Design an enzyme around this catalytic site. Sequence first.
Site, PDB file in Angstrom:
ATOM      1  CG  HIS A  58      29.031  12.599   3.943  1.00  0.00           C
ATOM      2  ND1 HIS A  58      29.751  11.423   3.905  1.00  0.00           N
ATOM      3  CD2 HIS A  58      27.864  12.345   3.306  1.00  0.00           C
ATOM      4  CE1 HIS A  58      29.049  10.499   3.272  1.00  0.00           C
ATOM      5  NE2 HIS A  58      27.901  11.033   2.899  1.00  0.00           N
ATOM      6  CG  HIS A  60      24.527  12.377  -0.754  1.00  0.00           C
ATOM      7  ND1 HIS A  60      25.082  11.469  -1.631  1.00  0.00           N
ATOM      8  CD2 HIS A  60      24.931  12.001   0.483  1.00  0.00           C
ATOM      9  CE1 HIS A  60      25.795  10.586  -0.954  1.00  0.00           C
ATOM     10  NE2 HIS A  60      25.721  10.888   0.331  1.00  0.00           N
ATOM     11  CD  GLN A 153      24.092   4.988  -3.503  1.00  0.00           C
ATOM     12  OE1 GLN A 153      24.584   4.055  -2.859  1.00  0.00           O
ATOM     13  NE2 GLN A 153      23.561   6.058  -2.916  1.00  0.00           N
ATOM     14  CG  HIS A 211      29.099   6.497   1.096  1.00  0.00           C
ATOM     15  ND1 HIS A 211      29.715   7.523   0.413  1.00  0.00           N
ATOM     16  CD2 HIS A 211      27.881   6.965   1.460  1.00  0.00           C
ATOM     17  CE1 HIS A 211      28.906   8.567   0.367  1.00  0.00           C
ATOM     18  NE2 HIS A 211      27.785   8.255   0.994  1.00  0.00           N
ATOM     19  CD  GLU A 214      24.986   4.920   5.177  1.00  0.00           C
ATOM     20  OE1 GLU A 214      25.427   4.959   4.010  1.00  0.00           O
ATOM     21  OE2 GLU A 214      24.042   5.651   5.577  1.00  0.00           O
ATOM     22  CG  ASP A 310      24.269  11.414   4.707  1.00  0.00           C
ATOM     23  OD1 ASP A 310      24.386  11.538   3.471  1.00  0.00           O
ATOM     24  OD2 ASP A 310      24.255  10.304   5.267  1.00  0.00           O
ATOM     25  CD1 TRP A 316      17.778   6.943   0.967  1.00  0.00           C
ATOM     26  CD2 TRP A 316      17.707   8.630  -0.505  1.00  0.00           C
ATOM     27  NE1 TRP A 316      17.713   6.397  -0.295  1.00  0.00           N
ATOM     28  CE2 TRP A 316      17.668   7.411  -1.217  1.00  0.00           C
ATOM     29  CE3 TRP A 316      17.673   9.834  -1.223  1.00  0.00           C
ATOM     30  CZ2 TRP A 316      17.594   7.359  -2.615  1.00  0.00           C
ATOM     31  CZ3 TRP A 316      17.598   9.783  -2.613  1.00  0.00           C
ATOM     32  CH2 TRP A 316      17.560   8.551  -3.292  1.00  0.00           C
TER      33      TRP A 316
HETATM   34 FE   LIG Z   1      26.506   9.821   1.913  1.00  0.00          FE
HETATM   35 MG   LIG Z   2      23.433   8.109   2.182  1.00  0.00          MG
END
Ligand SMILES: [Fe+3]
Ligand SMILES: [Mg+2]
Lengths: 423, 423
Positions: A58, A60, A153, A211, A214, A310, A316
């Site tokens: 996982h 991005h 997203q 996702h 979360e 992640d 982030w």
């Molecule tokens: Fe993610």
């Molecule tokens: Mg995230």
Amino acid sequence: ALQTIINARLPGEEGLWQIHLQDGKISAIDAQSGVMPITENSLDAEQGLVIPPFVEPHIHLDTTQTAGQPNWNQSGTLFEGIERWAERKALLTHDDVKQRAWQTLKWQIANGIQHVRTHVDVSDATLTALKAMLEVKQEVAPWIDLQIVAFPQEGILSYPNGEALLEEALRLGADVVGAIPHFEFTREYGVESLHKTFALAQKYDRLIDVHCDEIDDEQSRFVETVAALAHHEGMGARVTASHTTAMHSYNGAYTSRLFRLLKMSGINFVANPLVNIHLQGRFDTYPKRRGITRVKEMLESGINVCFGHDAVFDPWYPLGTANMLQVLHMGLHVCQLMGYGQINDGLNLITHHSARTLNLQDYGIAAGNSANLIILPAENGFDALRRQVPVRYSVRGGKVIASTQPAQTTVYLEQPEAIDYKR
Amino acid sequence: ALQTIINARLPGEEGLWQIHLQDGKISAIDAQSGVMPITENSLDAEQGLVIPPFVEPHIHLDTTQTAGQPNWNQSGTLFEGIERWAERKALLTHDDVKQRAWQTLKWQIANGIQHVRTHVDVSDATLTALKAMLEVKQEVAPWIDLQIVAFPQEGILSYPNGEALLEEALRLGADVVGAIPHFEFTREYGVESLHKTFALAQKYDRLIDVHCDEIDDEQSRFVETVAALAHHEGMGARVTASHTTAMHSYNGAYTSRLFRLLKMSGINFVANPLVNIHLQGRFDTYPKRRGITRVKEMLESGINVCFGHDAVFDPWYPLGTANMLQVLHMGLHVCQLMGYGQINDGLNLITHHSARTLNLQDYGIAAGNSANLIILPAENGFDALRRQVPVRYSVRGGKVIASTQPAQTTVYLEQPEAIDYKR
Ligand SMILES: [Fe+3]
Ligand SMILES: [Mg+2]
Ligand SMILES: [Fe+3]
Ligand SMILES: [Mg+2]
């Protein structure tokens, strides 16, 4: 070309082993009764640990490497991260996405990662990042098998043309169908979005990675729908619930009931220790919850769970070098998997369990499999983890694709002494 | 007829202003460089504050003025209030409703309130209170623009012919469609009732005002459906969620997710400080929650929120003189909006924000608008609030419809001294 890997230690096995290679595959694995001499065409593991490649289940890659551009996230909050990313919009181009994705992929290759699943934002009518990532997937294929998740997203039902864009992403080649039920406007949209996600996965024969929950909301229970739909369709192996941080806040009675379904469904779980400890618990004052899903209990129940990084160097999560042993180190601490055996077996959370999550069909040190393996300069999983060792050699298709010459530390006492951090 | 309002202070503005009137409207607004002399046809604000009329966004005129008839609510509880009201059933007639509604409306006129939204119970096959209120609306029109909400107090799906009666109320002229999802028998009925409410509002082109989540239940989340349906229909401006006291008990993570939708939807929120502090937290022992919705956070997020009195002199709230500055005073304290600026800006919660909630199209001190304004004998919002000043003059259509000669207080020390409570 390499013909043999000698003096190899294997997890859960006693002694040393010899791994014979032929035509890019593992032809046979034989135990040794002692140390074998090196020779031409032999890669000496030097009694180090040999394991199948590390896996990143996982990440991005569409946002990676953007921290500080044009400004830094000073509060470190999710909110500010969104604003900092928005300020960089003018730089988000096809070439920019490819350049940054490749930068992190190179760090992953260096870190013995040969399998990566990246989520790509598809809540963009232009699908800019997706088009770029599809090219990256082809370009990096000789070193990494990259899976692309079409990640809506902004929601499927809560964003204009969200469902149409998700399907368009699949028609363009995305390997996995994503979703984000807790971000939808309502619980009803959340549940409905999952039915749509499963319908798309069955229509296109793709995997699923949601996702899921979360959020530190004890009422966020979309995971039960993910598991129930997987069980109904008999497709647990192809399904993954990422995050499930809300599970950290569920009462025990519901969790116990839920676990029966989780086991029966056969779905996979991904926890992301570095980011979860950072972003969860932000609405608590003190005490503050950890916010990681129930990893220890999943392991005890035989439910497949693994760890992802992640995010790497973005708004982030500003840190990271895309190192799985570092991710594992954080997870063992936060999940309190600190017994010797728990730590030693920790490697499974970044190797075999992750391969299962990606539904890999050619993975593991076994005769017949492609010769994809890495060598760690450590005695076992515990040692590798404690010393945060680099990957000495990464082998793919029977060829070395990465190598790290270890650092050399010396202390100058009455006489110079080499320090290797072993007792 | 009045031609000018002179020596007026305006919120957020420096100095004194002159408001020119012509044909019942505001023709122009000009700044003054000093104090203007009084003269015929000039109403002197005397450096007092001039603002558009106070607004009552949420009141129950069908039950007002009934406290103690025939008996008093001695426990002060909701339960006893229901019983006390039931004992008065023999007196509930057309004329009785009109008489009591008019009594409170006169207090409102005296208190500078020119806009009122009253909820009327339509869970009554005879629709007695509604028929009476529709006549009151016509009768009071010269002084107050009254909006009537068809309020299905016993539920839409949980009461016999509830939906049919709600629609009948709209066919008779009710301006707003009401609902009460948390009072329905099940969560499913609650959600379904909202779909029916929105369908009726679109069918008849009416506004919506839901008694939403008025309960200390952290699982009461009907507000997300109200906001989502408004966003879907692109009608946020015409929608209001009254109370939302359950929001006071939500976890922070869900609230943060929800707020994005609340902002995007554009719906309005009404908090009723006097009644909420009284009726909420009744199932707690100690500590006891305040039970008011997240007013401070809504203001910080730019979400429209305002204050209503809710009830006046009835079984559910025995107090009140229908005074908005009193409602505001309670809200500032319970919501901890006690910084100087927060208190000073407090007037917006009983003027402009409430006008937005009622979707008013002719409101504010601006050229072209009807000459509807009130004069407070105070320097600014902070001063008016601190001293709980009366309305010196209420002007509607350019004519004075109410006036209060201030009380005169004298203390007899070594010499008599007038006390105005200013430093
Ligand atoms: Fe993610
Ligand atoms: Mg995230
Ligand atoms: Fe009410
Ligand atoms: Mg009420």
